[PDB]
Amino acid sequence: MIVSFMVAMDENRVIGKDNNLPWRLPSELQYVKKTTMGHPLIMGRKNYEAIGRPLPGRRNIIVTRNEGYHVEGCEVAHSVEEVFELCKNEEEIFIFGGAQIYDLFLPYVDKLYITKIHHAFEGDTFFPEMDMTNWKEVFVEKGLTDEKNPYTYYYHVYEKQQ
Ligand SMILES: NC(=O)c1ccc[n+]([C@@H]2O[C@H](COP(=O)([O-])OP(=O)(O)OC[C@H]3O[C@@H](n4cnc5c(N)ncnc54)[C@H](OP(=O)(O)O)[C@@H]3O)[C@@H](O)[C@H]2O)c1
Ligand SMILES: CCc1nc(N)nc(N)c1C#CCc1cc(OC)ccc1OC
């Protein structure tokens, strides 16, 4: 049906600014999570491991390959092979995976979002604007600084054909 993917974009990195990804409008995260609470969320064990997170969306699913392994506090998922079909399991599904994951999830994603932040230093995953022609933007929204977020950022809407 509809596959949504959420990914950030560090001005000096790409996603891993410092073992984890930045954050903005901590309030919006609650409103959306409360209204979406129940939607499937796919994330990488590496990112979920460093960050941890309790149970945002009451459906935190981490993709990891290791038979006989189980992570308490989160659901275990298989490679994109499983997620591929799991998609048809729910109308609108959210995917996060990570850097490498997003790459292979390119043909599996229908609509993607990118958030460019003007703040990043020494991280784990760096990848500046090298090639994004594969995608086609349709809308772009700007953000604004704040007390909890003294950093300026911008929201972008990426859409695919398939
Ligand atoms: N900007 C953002 O909003 C955002 C989003 C996500 C992550 N991040 C950050 O990205 C940092 C590192 O990300 P990363 O890209 O290096 O790793 P990652 O995307 O977070 O996760 C790597 C996963 O890819 C899986 N994988 C790779 N090749 C595979 C294959 N052929 N078959 C099955 N599974 C495969 C591995 O599974 P196994 O190792 O279990 O076999 C591994 O768990 C994290 O610290 C996280 O904080 C940021
Ligand atoms: C703004 C944070 C956010 N908003 C929405 N709508 N969806 C998300 N998946 C996220 C996120 C994130 C990463 C993250 C989560 C976390 O527990 C909720 C703690 C730290 C995090 O890294 C900043």
Residue list, ligand 1 pocket, CB within 6 Å: 7-8, 15-16, 19-21, 44-47, 50-51, 64-66, 79, 96-101, 124-125
- Residues in contact with ligand 2 by the CB-under-6-Å rule are 6, 20-21, 23-24, 29, 32, 51, 53, 56
Cβ atoms 64, 77 nearer than 8 A: yes
How far is 44 from 79, CA to CA, in rounded Å?
Answer: 10
- Beta-sheet strands, E only, within the chain: 2-10, 14-16, 41-44, 60-63, 75-77, 92-97, 111-117, 125-126, 136-142, 153-159
Q: What is the CATH number of the domain that holds 22?
A: 3.40.430.10
> What residue numbers bound the domain in which 135 lies?
1-162
Ligand 2 centroid – CA 83 distance (Å): 20
Please report, in range form, the residues annotated as the binding site: 8, 15, 19-20, 45-47, 64-66, 98-101, 108, 110, 125
Between CA 37 and CA 97 the distance in angstroms is 19
Structure determination method: NMR
- Count: domains in the chain: 1
